[PDB]
Design a protein around this ligand. Structure first.
Ligand SMILES: [K+]
Ligand SMILES: [K+]
Ligand SMILES: [K+]
Ligand SMILES: [K+]
Lengths: 95, 95, 95, 95
């Protein structure tokens, strides 16, 4: 239900926090930029305004992408179908 | 039906208008560039020829991506299967 | 069958040719670069080593993305399940 | 089963090795950077911190994308549903 969505939501934020912590400390980004970069990476947008410069960070980025894309897109999907779609249908009821 | 497609179409344009308004005013882009950037972002292409420079804009971009990807890809999917696919089948009928 | 795959294949190449023609003439790219850019765009990789510089090209790029992503990913999907998957299963048979 | 996952895993690494070999030798990247670039490309992130500079490499990149995206996203999907999802459910059992 909503708890399915809530758990995915929590997993997704924890995953984004891990990236924030990693890119803040290993790659020297401000926490806000490391969060923003983590999001841009796992949603596969990839502006490239930020990207890892160290070998450690490139290796982490490889694993982070493979492990986090599946979760992040699972969350977007549940966001879309269990939250945005009901809300839309609700907003379409005429009164 | 077609109204399902029409509603998604309207929601998608309204979402792209929101990004146009936000990136035009907060990030200083020409309206055309803010529209183009919004599209490039939510379809996950992400050239990076444009990207947010302010902290406010990076935070908005985080939320805009998570909220808009699901809708935009729902629309592309309905575009593909309820409009392009029938039109293709129609264009394959021999006479 | 295979003709389903063949038609999608033809549609996809015709779509990539349209982008090649457009970006070669309107954006001044070498045909090879315009083809490469069209592919990078519709598969949503978006390196940004190329991106449209004119207003005409940005507008075309908006429409090209929305119209071409659905087809290109339909083709990759049929490539994956009707061609690569059988070939893999075939290559797994022990003799 | 797990062997389905194991085979996809092997195919995916072999595909990433092919890109590593190609971009290391034809494009002159360090092996680590060619591996990192191959991953960033086939998951469709596409930072553009690296991108092919030679005509040979752009042509290979076209084919590599079309052939490798389907496999890489098949693997992420099986990673997500046959490995991460069971592990999550397991980690949710109360004791
Ligand atoms: K991308
Ligand atoms: K980029
Ligand atoms: K992408
Ligand atoms: K990109």
């Amino acid at each position: 239900k909503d708890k399915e969505f809530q758990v995915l939501f929590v997993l997704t934020i924890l995953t984004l926090i891990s990236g924030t912590i990693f890119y803040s400390t290993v790659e020297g980004l401000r926490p806000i930029d490391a969060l923003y970069f983590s999001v841009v990476t796992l949603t596969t947008v990839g502006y490239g305004d930020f990207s890892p410069q160290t070998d450690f960070g490139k290796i982490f980025t490889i694993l982070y992408i493979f492990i986090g894309i599946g979760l992040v897109f699972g969350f977007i999907h549940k966001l879309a179908v269990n939250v945005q779609l009901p809300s839309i249908l609700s907003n379409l009821v005429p009164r």
